[PDB]
Design a protein around this ligand. Structure first.
Ligand SMILES: C[C@H](Nc1ncnc2[nH]cnc12)c1cc2cccc(Cl)c2nc1-c1cccc(F)c1
Length: 814
């Protein structure tokens, strides 16, 4: 039965049994460790609701979706074979009560379980778009299809820490030296260097570097960071956990293959993986052989505790937090700063910190704050006990909320010192309790496994463990999806080599037909929208873009005869862009939408599906009935203020729907102006901005990132609102209205956005402190509501002063 592992390997894209690039058994130990959590979740998941995976939420239905309901009545069409009967229902009615199993027409999605109909996400999607709810009375799918295949005390050691640097070796290439840091978090506890030697293919020192920290004082999670400098500049780094996965001090002989720089806060610097490219890479050879507080002080403490996660703590600040430890422990918000005040290189202090962690009643009772929780999972905390109280708060997240934060919870595994962590186990568990979570976990993990040498090993092990409990059907499903993207990526990569396009449109359609009759299956799940199953290509409709990167525009029939639309499923396949950056930005746009929802604001963003599948390669969802702003301008002029406004007119049939497009545009434009300004990606050329035929503006192509402009509010955009250089219409006054409310609604979650932005830069954008601290300024940290309002409207006006000037400057450049 070893062909089951051979399968797993294929689904993963990496061989987890391979021990060709290890120097201990941490990886294998983690495989065995993950068995128990897997089975606990497997054995306790409800077979029925696992099969139907109701996508559901406990959040209230917002004001904007209440005022679309006809007096406590919502209509639901029901279909049998050629039947279409229409039942009246109240929002509070259950799938039990409305039944006089309802599956959604066209989709692999179910309205089942003890939930009111207003709390299913598919229902809310229908109310939002103005659409009506269509269902079939189907049999429940068989849970048997989901069957899972049958399976000296260290504190008595006063001697100083030392490491022997024997030397470095490189096959091919002034002078060079080795720096050896004892690190915890991004914090250097102790640092020693060698003397400089000439930089030859082999350099030997044969020297003991004796550190000032005692062996009894090395905290668990401490890394020996070995770096190589020339002159100075950093050229190579590698890490080694000083305390291993069995709580044993690391001992003996090491030859570690190192990573090279160029291609500084970057998550790759932290990895404990060695370079597997044994043949080209630099190696290093080492030997380990070993009353209560008064008023002004409270106010000073409260001011420290109130500051944003990127406000630096002085030595003075840290000393106050530590001395007033127990007062600080009463404020959940103090936690990141308090634990950044611990001297982790002193055992007796660490011990006190653990006694502090045992008194966390207020923490245990606090309401879940995701922003505060994520801060404890970032690069500044390497202690397992601190990180675990963060994961403990995650456990109360309902499934709707896991999905919102999933991409960034997977990225934050990169800040774990060990492969087996409470965070890895939380992701395993939540993924096996819910198919939608599991589907996306598969692809987020696979995305990293296929292109990150620094972390593929760790992520591979987590994914295997997921796959061994997701059950036979999901396995079949995953296999099918992977086969299709490998076929389609091949075709994408081949067409590209044949570089508008004449004999290429011939070649493309030949190859598609060739795949259609031969390799491509009956049907497959769309990776970015797991409820849709695509069938056979519409070869007629597929094309390649007049473009440097030559992406494929592909269109598919729907495999599901119960579907009530004729619409096709459109997927773009592209090589050339780093789509990891796009995934992170689009997910942050979804988080921004859910923030706005909490304050009854809809800004109609359009965060389309995107999945990185490999090195500079992946897929993008085709938004139907949409074109670019640049193209709309080419059409009428060959820049003019009015062309967008009457493009919108000629697509709207009735005056009823035109005005609807204009308002939808005012909202859309508001959302993207605020969102892009906060993320510092607002200055775009307008062939990276799109609009639907129904007025929904949306930015695209985020994985790319002179005079400046904060965002895009051009005269064509302004003209749709009714403003001509220096005027102010009703619709423009409303745009300002919405921008201001949207901006202030994001500032109420300042800490959350700062941590997500920080993490984003570090794990998906090869970064300095200067880069990270943009969003502080963008969110006008420290300022009041009225002063922030003035800031943003000044930005709105900075766009007005420039009209077309950056657009044209882009025109010349590009
Ligand atoms: C720029 C435009 N982008 C998107 N179009 C539709 N949905 C999307 N989702 C994300 N990006 C797009 C686009 C991408 C293409 C990719 C491959 C092949 C072709 Cl022919 C592409 N064409 C466009 C495009 C360009 C102008 C107008 C238009 F409707 C589409």
């Amino acid at each position: 039965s070893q062909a089951f592992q051979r399968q797993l390997t294929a689904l993963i894209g990496y061989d987890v049994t391979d021990v060709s690039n290890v120097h201990d058994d941490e990886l294998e130990f983690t495989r065995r460790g993950l068995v128990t959590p897997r089975m606990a979740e497997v054995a306790s998941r409800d077979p029925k609701l696992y099969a139907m995976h109701p996508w559901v939420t406990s959040k209230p239905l917002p004001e904007y979706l209440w005022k679309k309901i006809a007096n406590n009545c919502i209509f639901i069409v029901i279909h049998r074979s050629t039947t279409s009967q229409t039942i009246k229902v109240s929002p509070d009615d259950t799938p039990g009560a409305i039944l006089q199993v309802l599956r959604v027409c066209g989709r692999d999605e179910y309205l089942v379980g003890e939930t009111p109909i207003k709390n299913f996400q598919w229902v809310r999607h229908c109310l939002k778009n103005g659409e009506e709810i269509h269902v079939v009375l189907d049999t429940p799918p068989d849970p048997a299809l989901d069957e899972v295949r049958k399976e000296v005390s260290l504190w008595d050691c006063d001697r100083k820490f030392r490491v022997k640097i024997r030397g470095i070796d490189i096959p091919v290439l002034l002078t060079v030296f080795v720096e050896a840091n004892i690190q915890h978090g991004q914090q250097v506890l102790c640092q020693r260097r060698t003397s400089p030697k000439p930089f030859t293919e082999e350099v030997l020192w044969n020297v003991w570097l004796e550190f000032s920290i005692k062996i009894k004082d090395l905290p668990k999670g401490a890394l020996l960071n070995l770096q190589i400098y020339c002159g100075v500049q950093l050229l190579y780094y590698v890490n080694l956990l000083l305390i291993d996965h069995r709580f044993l001090l690391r001992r003996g002989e090491y030859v570690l293959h190192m990573w090279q720089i160029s291609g500084s806060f970057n998550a790759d610097k932290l990895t404990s993986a060695t370079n597997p490219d044994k043949e080209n890479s630099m190696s290093i050879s080492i030997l380990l052989d070993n009353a209560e507080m008064p008023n002004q002080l409270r106010k000073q403490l409260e001011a420290i505790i109130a500051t944003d996660p990127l406000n630096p703590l002085t030595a003075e600040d840290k000393e106050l937090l530590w001395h007033f430890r127990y007062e600080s422990l009463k404020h959940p918000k103090a936690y990141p700063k308090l634990f950044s005040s611990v001297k982790w290189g002193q055992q007796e202090i660490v011990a006190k910190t653990y006694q502090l962690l045992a008194r966390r009643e207020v923490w245990d009772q606090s309401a879940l704050d995701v922003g505060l929780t994520m801060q404890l999972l970032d690069c500044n905390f390497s202690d397992e006990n601190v990180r675990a109280i963060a994961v403990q708060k995650l456990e109360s997240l309902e499934d709707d909320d896991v999905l919102h934060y999933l991409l960034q919870l997977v990225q934050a595994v990169k800040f774990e010192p060990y492969h087996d962590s409470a965070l890895a186990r939380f992701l395993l568990k939540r993924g096996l309790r819910n198919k939608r979570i599991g589907h996306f976990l598969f692809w987020f993990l696979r995305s990293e496994i296929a292109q990150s040498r620094h972390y593929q090993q760790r992520f591979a092990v987590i994914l295997e463990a997921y796959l061994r409990g997701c059950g036979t059907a999901m396995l079949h499903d995953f296999t099918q999806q992977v086969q299709v993207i490998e076929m389609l990526q091949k075709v994408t990569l081949d067409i590209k080599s044949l570089s508008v396009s004449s004999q290429v449109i011939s070649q493309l359609k030949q190859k598609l037909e060739n795949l259609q009759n031969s390799q491509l299956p009956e049907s497959f799940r769309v990776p970015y929208d797991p409820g849709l199953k695509a069938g056979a290509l519409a070869i007629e409709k597929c094309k390649v873009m007049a473009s440097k990167k030559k992406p494929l525009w592909l269109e598919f029939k729907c495999a599901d005869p119960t579907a009530l639309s004729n619409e096709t499923i459109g997927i773009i396949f592209k090589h050339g862009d780093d789509l990891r950056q796009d995934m992170l930005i689009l997910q942050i746009l979804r988080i921004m939408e859910s923030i706005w929802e909490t304050e009854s604001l809809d800004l109609c963003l359009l965060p389309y599906g995107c999945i990185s599948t490999g090195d500079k390669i992946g897929m993008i969802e085709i938004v139907k009935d949409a074109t670019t702003i640049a193209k709309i301008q080419q059409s009428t002029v060959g820049f003019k203020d009015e062309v967008l406004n009457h493009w919108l007119k000629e697509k709207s049939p009735t005056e009823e729907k035109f005005q609807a497009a204009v308002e939808r545009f005012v909202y859309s434009c508001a959302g993207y102006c605020v969102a892009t300004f906060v993320l510092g990606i607002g200055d775009r050329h307008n062939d990276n901005i799109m609009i639907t035929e129904t007025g929904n503006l949306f930015h695209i192509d985020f994985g790319h990132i002179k005079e400046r402009v904060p965002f895009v509010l051009t005269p064509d955009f302004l003209f749709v609102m009714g403003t001509s250089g220096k005027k102010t219409s009703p619709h423009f006054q409303k745009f300002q209205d919405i921008c201001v409310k949207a901006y202030l609604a994001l500032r109420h979650h300042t800490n959350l956005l700062i941590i997500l932005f920080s993490m984003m830069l570090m794990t998906g954008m090869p970064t300095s402190k200067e880069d990270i601290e943009y969003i502080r300024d963008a969110l006008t940290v420290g300022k009041n509501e009225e002063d922030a309002k003035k800031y943003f409207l000044d930005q709105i006006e900075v766009c007005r002063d420039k009209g077309w000037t950056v657009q044209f400057n882009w025109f010349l450049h590009l």
